[PDB]
Amino acid sequence: ADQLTEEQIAEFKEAFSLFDKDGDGTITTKELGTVMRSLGQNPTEAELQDMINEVDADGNGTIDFPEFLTMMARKMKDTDSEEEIREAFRVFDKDGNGYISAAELRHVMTNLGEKLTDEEVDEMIREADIDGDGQVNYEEFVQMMTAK
C-alpha cells in the first residue's frame, strides 16, 4: 500500500515547522542559510540559489509546505537522491583523498553524538569492501547503495 495517509503527513509537518523559524509556513533563504550556518558552513547566495531554484515551482524564491512535501516523497522517485549520494561522499570523505579511511568515518559520527564499537565498524568495512582495496571509493560507495 503506497497510498499516502493523512497521519503520516502530520508526522513530518511537525518537523517542517522547526526549519521555518518565521512561522509564516514558508522557508526563506535567510532562514535556511542562518540554520545551515550552525552546521559550521559558509555558503554563498549563488550556491543556495541553484539548490532552492531547482525545486521552486511557484518561482517565489521560497519553499512552500507542499513543495517540501513533494521532496519528502521524492525519495521514492530517487530523483535528487543521485545528487545527495554524490554530495554525501564529499561530507563523509573529510580527507578528500577520494577514499574513505576507517579513522575518518568515526569522526563525523562522533560530532553527531553517535558512536559504535570497533568490531561494528570493522565488520561494516569488510562487508562494503568489494574491490578489496582496503578503502571505500566512489565506485564502492555508489555501487553499495544501488542494491535491490
Binding site: 552546521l39 543556495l48 539548490m51 521532496m71 535528487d80 537522491s81 545528487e83 545527495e84 554525501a88
Partner: peptide, 19 residues
C-alpha cells in the same frame, strides 16, 4: 539545504538496513 534535508531520510531508514 533542500538536498541536505533529503539526506536525513537516507541516514534514517537507509542506515536501518544495517541491522
Amino acid at each position: 539545504m533542500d538536498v541536505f534535508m533529503k539526506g536525513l531520510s537516507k541516514a534514517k531508514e537507509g542506515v536501518v538496513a544495517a541491522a
